[PDB]
Amino acid sequence: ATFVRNAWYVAALPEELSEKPLGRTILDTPLALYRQPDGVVAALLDICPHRFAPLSDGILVNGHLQCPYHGLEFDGGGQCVHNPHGNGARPASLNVRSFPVVERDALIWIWPGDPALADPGAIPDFGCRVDPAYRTVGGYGHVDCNYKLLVDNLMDLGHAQYVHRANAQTDAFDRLEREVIVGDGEIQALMKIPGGTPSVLMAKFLRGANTPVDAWNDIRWNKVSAMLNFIAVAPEGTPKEQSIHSRGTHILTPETEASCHYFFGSSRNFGIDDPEMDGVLRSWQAQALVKEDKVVVEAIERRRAYVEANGIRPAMLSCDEAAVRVSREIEKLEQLEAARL
Amino acid sequence: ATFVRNAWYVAALPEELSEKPLGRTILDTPLALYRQPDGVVAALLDICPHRFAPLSDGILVNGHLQCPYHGLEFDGGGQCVHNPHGNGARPASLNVRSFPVVERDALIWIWPGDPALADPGAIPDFGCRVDPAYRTVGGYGHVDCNYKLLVDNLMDLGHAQYVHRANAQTDAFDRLEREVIVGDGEIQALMKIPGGTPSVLMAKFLRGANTPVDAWNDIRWNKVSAMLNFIAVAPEGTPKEQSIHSRGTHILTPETEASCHYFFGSSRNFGIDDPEMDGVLRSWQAQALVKEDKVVVEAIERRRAYVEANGIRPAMLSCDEAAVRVSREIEKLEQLEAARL
Amino acid sequence: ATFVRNAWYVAALPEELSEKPLGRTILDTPLALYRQPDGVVAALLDICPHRFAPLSDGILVNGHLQCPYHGLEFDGGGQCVHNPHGNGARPASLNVRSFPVVERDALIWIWPGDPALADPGAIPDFGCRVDPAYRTVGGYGHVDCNYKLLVDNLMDLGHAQYVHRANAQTDAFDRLEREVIVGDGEIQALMKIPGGTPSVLMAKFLRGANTPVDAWNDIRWNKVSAMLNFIAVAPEGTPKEQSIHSRGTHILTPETEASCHYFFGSSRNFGIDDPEMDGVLRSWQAQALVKEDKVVVEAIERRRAYVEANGIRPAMLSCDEAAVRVSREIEKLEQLEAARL
Ligand SMILES: COc1c(Cl)ccc(Cl)c1C(=O)O
Ligand SMILES: COc1c(Cl)ccc(Cl)c1C(=O)O
Ligand code: FES
Ligand code: FES
Ligand code: FES
Ligand SMILES: [Co+2]
Ligand SMILES: [Co+2]
Ligand SMILES: [Co+2]
Ligand SMILES: [Co+2]
Ligand SMILES: [Co+2]
Ligand SMILES: [Co+2]
Ligand SMILES: [Co+2]
C-alpha cells in the first residue's frame, strides 16, 4: 500500500526477457515485459484496455504484442496499432499504459510512478556489471517478506555469524569500527578489518605479505532499495583499488506489501576465466538467500500482525546504525511522496 | 454479495444426483442436493437446525436425510420427521429450509430467493437436451471468476478466433456480419461467416471436408445467466434452416462473489450414432471451455482489485453490443431487487 | 479476538518438549516452549525484542535460548543474559516477555493473561494422569474450528451414537438417563445406558461380556475448556464405583479465533500391563477424536459466516443442557473480562 513509486526499480534481468512476454508485478502493478524484434525492451501495464485480459499471455505478431482475448495489437509505447474488429477504428481509449524502461548495467530498470518525473540520469550506478575487467554471475529470487526487512538484512553485518555461518564466521566482538556516511539518496557503510582472513576463493590469488591492515567489507545503498557491496583483501598496505575483490549487486523490488523480488549478482576481478568459479559464486549467493536469509525474514513477516496489534517497537543495538539510517531515509521518501497525493 | 436471488439457476446435472447427498454452494448458500427413493430431487439448506452440521454428509434413512451429528431426520420439504431424543418431540423450530426445485430438460433448476415469487414461467427452454432427434453430451466445470465475466465471454463468441485459435480460427473472419435482436426478456447475438474455408473444428463436423462453406454462430441469453448457442456449418449458399448444427448449453451459476459453476453441453443433429463425434465434442469442451476460457477469465478476475482501486473502465469495440446489453439487463435486475430489501 | 486470557490453558504435553524449542500459538500469541538443562520448562513470547525473529527457531547455548538472527541469549524468565554486540550492554529493553508456566499431571499449563493474577492453585486437577494405579496413553491434535464447538461436542457425549456409530452405537440409547451437576466454575453431565448390548468399543475394553451391560459416560468441565470424562462398563448389575474404567483427558486450547489445539488422553485402571489395550485406545483416539469429530466441527466452522450473516440461532434438544450451561459460563467469563479495561 505504501511504496515510493517515484524511483527506478529493477524489474528483471536481461536474460529473463525475450519475444515471449514475462508477467511480473511491481509495487502492486502487473506488468508485461518483453523484448521487441529490434532488441529494445518494452514494459506495458498487463491489463488490456478492452476487457482487461493479461497481455503477458499473448504473443508477438509482426513485432507487436497481441492480446490473447480479442486480438488488439500494441507497440512498445502502448499505442494500439491494430484493431481487427468492425471498421478497425483505433480511438485513444484503446492505448495501454507504458512505463519508462531502461536497460543498463545488465539490469532492466523501470519507473512505476509519475512518468513526467522519470530521469534516466537518476538511475543507480552499477557499471561494474558490464565492465570487461569484471566477471559477473547472478540470479533472481522471490521472497515472501516486506522488502524493508531485506534492506535491513543487507545493511547489517551482525547476523553473518549466526545466519551465514557456513561461509561468514568469526569470534571477535572487541574490534569493530564501521563508519556510516550519509549522502543524498546514497549511504555507504565502510568497514576495514586489519589482519582479516581472506575468502577461500580470493586467497588463491594472493602471493604473500599478510600484515594487519588488509581486508574490507563495505556496502553502498541508493534511493529506496538498491545496494552494491565491496568484499576485498590486500597484501599489506595497498589501497582498495588494487585488491582482490567482488562487487555484489543486491537489489530489492517490492511485489506486494508482504512480498518482493530479489536480484543478486557478483562482479569479481579475480578468476575471470574460471567457468566453474561462476557456478560456485552464484550458488553461495543463492544459498545465502534461499536457504538462510529467506527463512529468517519470512518468519519475521509472519509476526508483523502481532507486533502491530500490540505496540511493540524494535530495540536497537550498536550494530544497527547503518540500517536505522537507511530505514529513516526510506521513510522520508514515503512522506515526501505522499505529500503530493 | 450482490446476486440476483429471485431467479432460477441450475444447481446440478441429473447424473450428479443420487441417494448420496451432494453438497454445493449456490449464491453463497450451502445446499444439500439429493434424489429421494421415489426419484424426486430435493434441495435443503445444508445446515442442520440443531447445531449446524452439514446435512450433505449424512445418509438416507427410510427415504429421509439423517443428520450425521445427532440423528435428526428430514423429508424433502425440510420437515423434521424424526427426533430420536427425549420425548421425541418435533417443534417447528426443527424444520430446515427447503428450496423450490424443478428437474427439467436434463437440468436441475433451483430458486434461491423469495420462495413466494418462485415463478416457474421463468424457467428457460432447453428442450433440445431431451429431444430424441438430438444427441447431447456435456459436463460440469468450476471457475474462479465472477460469473459475469463468463457471461461476457459467451456473448462475444468472436473470441474463439484468438482464444480457441487451433480449432476455431477462420480465414473469413473479416467478412463477419453480426446483428443483435432484443425481445421480451431475451437477447440474441447472431454472427455469420460467409464463403470461407471451414475451421479445423467445423471440418471435423463435416467429416474432413474442404470446399467453401457458410458458418453461423448464434447465441441466446435468458434472464440472468442461462445461454443456448447455435453453431452451424453448411456448403456454399445453402439455407441456414436445413443446416447441420449443434445447440450449445452454456449456463453459469454463481457460487461466491468471485467463483461460479459452469454447466456446458452440446446437442447435435448430426453423427447421432457416432462415438467418435462424441469424442470430438468432449475434447473441444475440455480444451476450450474448461481450459482455454478458464485461463483468460481467471486472469481477469485477478486484475479486478487493481482496476477498481484505480478508476479503470473497459473500452468497448464494435463486437460488444450483445454483451453490453446483457450486462445492462443484469445490472437492472440487481437494482430492482435491491430496491426491494 | 475474544478469548478469556485470564485462565490456565494447556500449551503442550511433556513429551513434546525438549532442548529444541517448540513454536506454538496460544490465544493468538506465538510462544517458544522448551525444557532447560535443569529440566524446568520455560515459555517465552516467540518474538525477539531486537528485530522480531522467532526465538523458537533458535538453539540453546549454555542453557540459554539464543536468537537465530543476531545471537541475543535469554534465560527462562526472559532476561537477556548475553548481547554479543558492541560493549555488550544489556538494557531492560532487551528482555523478552515470559509466561507463568506449570508442569503438573503430565500437562504443561500456561497463563496467557495478566501475569499478576496467575495462581498455580487454580489449575484443574488431572491427578489420574500420574497415578501409578492408572495407565495413560494420549496425544495431540490440531483442529480448524473455534474451540467452543469442540467443548460443545465433548459435553454431549451422545453424538458418539451417530458420529462414531461404528465404534460406540448402543441399542439401549433410547433408555438413557441424564443428570447435570452445576457448581462454581464447574459443570458435570452424567449419562447412563442401562441393560444394553455393549458397543463395539465397550466390548473391546471388557474382552467379551455376554450378559446385559450397564454403561456410564460422565464428563466434568472446569473453567474455560478443560474436561475429564469417566467411561465405565460392567456386566449384569455391577455398581459404577467398584468397577473397570478409563478417565479421559480432553482439553482444548484456542490457537486463533477459528482454530484450536486438542490434547487428549486415556487413564485406565485395567489392562495396565497390556500393550494390546494401548492399541485399542490409540486406535479409537485416532479414528473418533482426530478424524471423525474433526470432520464435523470443521464443516460447522465453514458454515459460521452464513449463519451469522442471516440471523440463524441453534435449536436446542433435551440432550443439550450440559453444553448450554458451559456455553453460558464461558460467555459470562468473556463479559467479565471485557468489563475491566
Ligand atoms: C462456445 O460455443 C461453441 C462455438 Cl463458438 C463453437 C463450437 C462449439 Cl462445439 C461451441 C459450443 O457450444 O461448445
Ligand atoms: C470422547 O469420550 C469418549 C467416549 Cl464418549 C467413549 C470412549 C472413550 Cl475411550 C472416550 C475418550 O475418553 O476418548
Ligand atoms: S481483452 Fe484484449 S482485445 Fe479484448
Ligand atoms: S447438528 Fe443435526 S441433529 Fe444435531
Ligand atoms: S532479531 Fe534476535 S538478536 Fe536480532
Ligand atoms: Co511497430
Ligand atoms: Co544475510
Ligand atoms: Co417418511
Ligand atoms: Co471460449
Ligand atoms: Co542461566
Ligand atoms: Co560476550
Ligand atoms: Co466425538
Name which of B138, B103, B150 is nearest B8 in CA terms. B103
Report the Cα–Cα distance between both ends of chain A, in Å, rounded.
13
Note whether C130 and C15 are within 8 A (CB). Answer: no
Q: Does the annotation place A229 within a ligand binding site? A: yes
Distance CA B37, CA B32 (A): 16
Query: C147-154 and C321-338 are packed helices; what angle lies between their axes, rounded to 10 degrees?
Result: 150
Q: Which of C27, C70, C90, C256 to mutate to test the interface with A (most CBs of A within 10 A)?
A: C70
Distance CA C281, CA C167 (A): 11
Q: State the smallest CA–CA distance between residue B335 and chain C in angstroms.
A: 21
Distance CA C324, CA C333 (A): 14
Q: How far is the CA of A103 from the centre of ligand 3 (A)?
A: 29
Chain B residues near residue A57 by CB distance under 8 angstroms = 295-296, 299
List CB contacts of A341: < 8 A, sequence separation 6 or more.
Answer: none
β-bridge mates for residue B299, sequence order: none
Report the Cα–Cα distance between both ends of chain B, in Å, rounded.
14
Distance CA B64, CA B36 (A): 8
Distance CA B259, CA B252 (A): 10
Chain B residues near residue A93 by CB distance under 8 angstroms = 315
3-state secondary structure of C58: coil
Q: Which of C155, C174, C296, C307 to mutate to test the interface with B (most CBs of B within 10 A)?
A: C296
Residue C92 backbone phi and psi in degrees, to 5: -55, -25
Distance CA B36, CA B20 (A): 10
DSSP secondary structure letter of residue B218: E
**Pocket of ligand 2 contains residue C233 by CB under 6 Å:** no
Distance CA A248, CA A234 (A): 18
Distance CA C56, CA C40 (A): 17
Name which of C109, C93, C81, C132 is nearest C263 in CA terms. C109
Which residue matches cell numbers 446437442? Answer: B267
Could you tell me whether strands C226-234 and C245-256 are parallel, antiparallel, or unpaired per DSSP bridges?
Answer: antiparallel
Pocket mutation for ligand 1, best pick of B284, B292, B294 (most atoms within 8 Å of C-beta): B284
Joined together, the cell numbers standing for residue A61 give: 505478431
Q: Do B91 and C315 touch (CB under 8 A)?
A: yes
Name which of C285, C295, C283, C280 is nearest C264 in CA terms. C285
Q: Which of B69, B73, B82, B94 to mutate to test the interface with C (most CBs of C within 10 A)?
A: B69
**Cα-atom radius of gyration of chain A, to the nearest Å?**
22
Which residue matches cell numbers 544497527? Answer: A320
Distance CA B88, CA B66 (A): 15
Joined together, the cell numbers standing for residue A162 give: 549466526
Spell out where chain B has E strands: 9-12, 22-26, 29-35, 41-45, 59-61, 64-66, 73-74, 80-82, 101-104, 107-110, 135-143, 177-183, 186-196, 213-222, 226-235, 244-256, 259-268
Distance CA B113, CA B336 (A): 14
Name which of B299, C19, B301 is nearest A55 in CA terms. B299
Distance CA A12, CA B271 (A): 53
β-bridge mates for residue C190, sequence order: C179
**CATH 2.102.10.10 domain range(s) in chain B:** 1-130
Distance CA C187, CA C178 (A): 13
Note whether C206 and C223 are within 8 A (CB). Answer: no
Distance CA B126, CA B122 (A): 12
Note whether A87 and A40 are within 8 A (CB). Answer: no
Count of beta carbons in the 10 Å neighbourhood of residue B2: 12
Name the residue with the closest Cα to ligand 1, atom 6. Answer: B231
Residue A315 backbone phi and psi in degrees, to 5: -100, 110
State the DSSP H helix or E strand holding residue C32, giving kind and residue range, or none if neither. Answer: strand C29-35
3-state secondary structure of B14: helix
Distance CA A168, CA A155 (A): 15
Could you tell me whether strands A80-82 and A215-222 are parallel, antiparallel, or unpaired per DSSP bridges?
Answer: unpaired
Structure-solving method: X-ray
Kindly list the strands in the beta sheet with B41-45, ordered across the sheet, starting from the edge strand earlier in the chain: B22-26, B29-35, B41-45
Name which of A3, A49, A50 is nearest A25 in CA terms. A3
Note whether A197 and A306 are within 8 A (CB). Answer: no
β-bridge mates for residue A216, sequence order: A192, A232
Distance CA C113, CA C279 (A): 38
Q: Do B312 and A94 touch (CB under 8 A)?
A: no
Joined together, the cell numbers standing for residue A255 give: 511485489
The dotted CATH code for B1-130 is 2.102.10.10
Kindly list the strands in the beta sheet with C9-12, ordered across the sheet, starting from the edge strand earlier in the chain: C9-12, C107-110, C101-104
Could you tell me whether strands C41-45 and B59-61 are parallel, antiparallel, or unpaired per DSSP bridges?
Answer: unpaired
Distance CA C197, CA B334 (A): 59
Distance CA C239, CA C250 (A): 25
**Cα-atom radius of gyration of chain C, to the nearest Å?**
22
How far are the Cα atoms of A26, A96, A258, A313, C54 from residue A300, in angstroms, in the given order?
A: 22, 38, 11, 13, 7
Residue A183 backbone phi and psi in degrees, to 5: -120, -155
State the DSSP H helix or E strand holding residue C41, giving kind and residue range, or none if neither. Answer: strand C41-45
Q: Give me the residue from A296, A312, A319 closest to C53, CB to CB.
A: A296
Name the residue with the closest Cα to ligand 5, atom 1. Answer: C51
3-state secondary structure of C223: coil
3-state secondary structure of B7: coil
How far are the Cα atoms of A108, C141, C219, C220 from residue C251, in angstroms, in the given order?
A: 57, 11, 12, 11
3-state secondary structure of C319: helix
Name which of A268, A264, A233 is nearest A247 in CA terms. A268
**Tally of residues, chain B:** 341
Count of beta carbons in the 10 Å neighbourhood of residue C127: 14
Joined together, the cell numbers standing for residue C311 give: 440471523
Name which of B238, B190, B231 is nearest B213 in CA terms. B238
Distance CA C296, CA C144 (A): 11
State the DSSP H helix or E strand holding residue C234, giving kind and residue range, or none if neither. Answer: strand C226-234
List CB contacts of C169: < 8 A, sequence separation 6 or more.
Answer: C160, C161, C162, C199, C200
Residue B173 backbone phi and psi in degrees, to 5: -60, -35
3-state secondary structure of B329: helix
> Residue C225: what residue type?
S
3-state secondary structure of B319: helix
Q: Give me the residue from B173, B174, B296 closest to A53, CB to CB.
A: B296
Name which of A254, A213, A246, A219 is nearest A110 in CA terms. A254
Which residue matches cell numbers 511491481? Answer: A26
In chain B, what are the helix, strand and coil shares in percent, each to the nearest 5? 30, 35, 40
> Residue A47: what residue type?
I
Quote the Cα angle for C147-C153-C158, to 5°.
Answer: 175
Distance CA A158, CA A163 (A): 9
Distance CA B247, CA B131 (A): 12
Distance CA C188, CA C219 (A): 6
State the DSSP H helix or E strand holding residue C321, giving kind and residue range, or none if neither. Answer: helix C321-338
**CATH 3.90.380.10 domain range(s) in chain A:** 131-341
Name which of C289, C156, C159 is nearest C218 in CA terms. C156
Joined together, the cell numbers standing for residue B1 give: 454479495
> Residue B103: what residue type?
E
Q: Do B152 and A57 touch (CB under 8 A)?
A: no
Joined together, the cell numbers standing for residue C276 give: 494390546
Q: How far is the CA of B95 from the centre of ligand 8 (A)?
A: 14
Q: Which residues does B contribute to its contact with A (CB < 8 Å)?
A: 152, 156, 158-159, 161-163, 173-174, 295-296, 299-300, 303, 306-307, 312, 314-319
Instruction: Count Cβ–Cβ pairs < 8 Å, chain A vs chain B.
Output: 63
The dotted CATH code for A131-341 is 3.90.380.10
Kindly list the strands in the beta sheet with B259-268, ordered across the sheet, starting from the edge strand earlier in the chain: B135-143, B259-268, B244-256, B226-235, B213-222, B186-196, B177-183
Note whether C214 and C237 are within 8 A (CB). Answer: yes
Count of beta carbons in the 10 Å neighbourhood of residue B277: 20
Listed resolution, Å? 2.0
Residue C83 backbone phi and psi in degrees, to 5: -125, 110
How far are the Cα atoms of A1, A252, A305, C196, C302 from residue A258, in angstroms, in the given order?
A: 10, 13, 11, 60, 27
**Pocket of ligand 2 contains residue C199 by CB under 6 Å:** no
Q: Do C307 and B83 touch (CB under 8 A)?
A: no
Name which of C86, C58, C87 is nearest C73 in CA terms. C58
Residue C164 backbone phi and psi in degrees, to 5: -110, 30
Note whether A272 and A201 are within 8 A (CB). Answer: no
List CB contacts of A32: < 8 A, sequence separation 6 or more.
Answer: A21, A22, A23, A43, A44, A45, A46, A54, A55, A56, A58, A65
Distance CA B312, CA A291 (A): 41
Kindly list the strands in the beta sheet with A80-82, ordered across the sheet, starting from the edge strand earlier in the chain: A59-61, A64-66, A73-74, A80-82
The 3-state secondary structure of chain A reads CCCCCCCCEEEECHHHCCCCCEEEEECCEEEEEEECCCCCEEEEECCCCCCCCCHHHCEEECCEEECCCCCCEECCCCCEEECCCCCCCCCHHHCCCECCEEEECCEEEECCCCHHHCCHHHCCCCHHHHCCCCEEEEEEEEECCCHHHHHHHHCCCCCHHHHCCCCCCCCCCCCCCCEEEECCCEEEEECECCCCCCCHHHHCCCCCCCCCCCEEEEEEEECCCEEEEEEEECCCCCCHHHCEEEEEEEEEEEEECCEEEEEEEEEECCCCCCHHHHHHHHHHHHHHHHHHHHHHHHHHHCCHHHHHHCCCCCCCCHHHHHHHHHHHHHHHHHHHHHCCC
State the DSSP H helix or E strand holding residue B205, giving kind and residue range, or none if neither. Answer: helix B200-205
Residue C210 backbone phi and psi in degrees, to 5: -90, -70
Distance CA C214, CA C194 (A): 5
Chain B residues near residue A71 by CB distance under 8 angstroms = 161-162
Name which of C260, C267, C221 is nearest C124 in CA terms. C221
Name which of B93, B111, B91, B88 is nearest B101 in CA terms. B111
Note whether B254 and B260 are within 8 A (CB). Answer: yes
Which residue matches cell numbers 440423528? Answer: B71
Residue B194 backbone phi and psi in degrees, to 5: -80, 145
Name the residue with the closest Cα to ligand 3, atom 3. Answer: A70
**Tally of residues, chain C:** 341
Joined together, the cell numbers standing for residue A285 give: 549467493
What distance lies between CA A190 and its chain's CA centroid?
20
3-state secondary structure of C106: coil
β-bridge mates for residue A10, sequence order: A109
What distance lies between CA B159 and its chain's CA centroid?
19
Could you tell me whether strands B80-82 and B73-74 are parallel, antiparallel, or unpaired per DSSP bridges?
Answer: antiparallel
Distance CA B264, CA B254 (A): 15
List CB contacts of A256: < 8 A, sequence separation 6 or more.
Answer: A25, A28
Q: Give me the residue from A71, A87, A91 closest to B162, CB to CB.
A: A71
Q: Is C319 left (phi over 0), alpha (psi -120 to 50) or beta?
A: alpha
Distance CA B339, CA A311 (A): 45
Name which of A98, A82, A102 is nearest A90 in CA terms. A82
List CB contacts of B71: < 8 A, sequence separation 6 or more.
Answer: B82, B84, B85, C161, C162
